[PDB]
Amino acid sequence: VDCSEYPKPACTLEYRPLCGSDNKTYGNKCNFCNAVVESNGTLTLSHFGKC
């Protein structure tokens, strides 16, 4: 996952989930990367798919 261009606060709402280190399922890469920058870098990727 590449979060370099973020924040880009508007995302498509296709569900292609990622699971964060916070045990929350993010709807897609865009939702995840916006949460990473708000975090601020604390949130990392556990794995692709639902938690």
Partner: protein, 274 residues
């Protein structure tokens, strides 16, 4: 050789199409990653781009093309069939090929749609926080008589927490959650007070670039079912206000359970267009 995706009969759009009302002369703007206008199963008649270096009538992501086919895939011997297959379809590119964007780009798209006399806006998109510019744009569009529809969000549920995103959370916008082909809520579908109606958002088959088809999940897929339903209602009843179309959709929906998880339930466009 044409497939009718399951969402069409599930919302009873086939019943309204059988009466002859298919969305003709109704202008629907898909605010998204563009639309592949050269797709054999889509006619794009206009639009605008607010993403630098990208044309309105191409789609490097695929998402906008999928959303557009749920609304408006052509009735022919190939591909799929839209909810409102005779709709005048406008590609308003507000997201890049990565499927992300700024709120200034979305506002530009909403303003374009309002200025150019769109009857329906679909926004299969959202962010975690509001902006006052975004709120002003959707409030104005609705006030000027545009039916504004958006995906509720894919943040799921977590106890009593509200997970509806923006612009769906604004009271000028119909927030649309997702059910599957058994009419059960999809686990990812956002929840909260502002959730208004549900439509098919799990395993939705539609157009996809280049000249092909794909099955996707998300409230993104549910939203165009409702935008298309609004277009069917207006093709039958052209003098209705946006609030009249909106109230028809929510008041005639099939109750599925607690409004926190389902809003008023699954849209029934046959009932809504009575």
């Amino acid at each position: 050789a044409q497939t009718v995706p399951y969402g069409i009969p599930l919302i009873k759009a086939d019943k309204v199409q059988a009466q002859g009302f298919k969305g003709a002369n109704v202008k629907v703007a898909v605010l998204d990653t563009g639309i592949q206008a050269s797709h054999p199963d889509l006619n794009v008649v206009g639009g605008a781009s607010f993403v630098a270096g990208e044309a309105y009538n191409t789609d490097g992501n695929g998402h906008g093309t999928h959303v557009a086919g749920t609304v408006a895939a052509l009735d022919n011997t190939t591909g799929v069939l839209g909810v409102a297959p005779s709709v005048s379809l406008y590609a308003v590119k507000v997201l890049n090929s990565s499927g992300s964007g700024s709120y200034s780009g979305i506002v530009s798209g909403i303003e374009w749609a309002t200025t150019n006399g769109m009857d329906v806006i679909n926004m299969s998109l959202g962010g975690a926080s509001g902006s006052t510019a975004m709120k002003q744009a959707v409030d104005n569009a609705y006030a000027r008589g545009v039916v504004v529809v958006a995906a509720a969000g894919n943040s799921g549920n977590s106890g009593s927490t509200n997970t509806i995103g923006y612009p769906a959370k604004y009271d000028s916008v119909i927030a649309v959650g997702a059910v599957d082909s058994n009419s059960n809520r999809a686990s990812f579908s956002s929840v909260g007070a502002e959730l208004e109606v549900m439509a098919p958002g799990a395993g939705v088959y539609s157009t996809y670039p280049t000249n092909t088809y794909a099955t996707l999940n998300g409230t993104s897929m549910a939203s165009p079912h409702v935008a298309g339903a609004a277009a069917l209602i207006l093709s039958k009843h052209p003098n209705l206000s946006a609030s009249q179309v909106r109230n028809r959709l929510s008041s005639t929906a099939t109750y599925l359970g607690s409004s926190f998880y389902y809003g008023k339930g699954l849209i029934n466009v046959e009932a809504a267009a009575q």
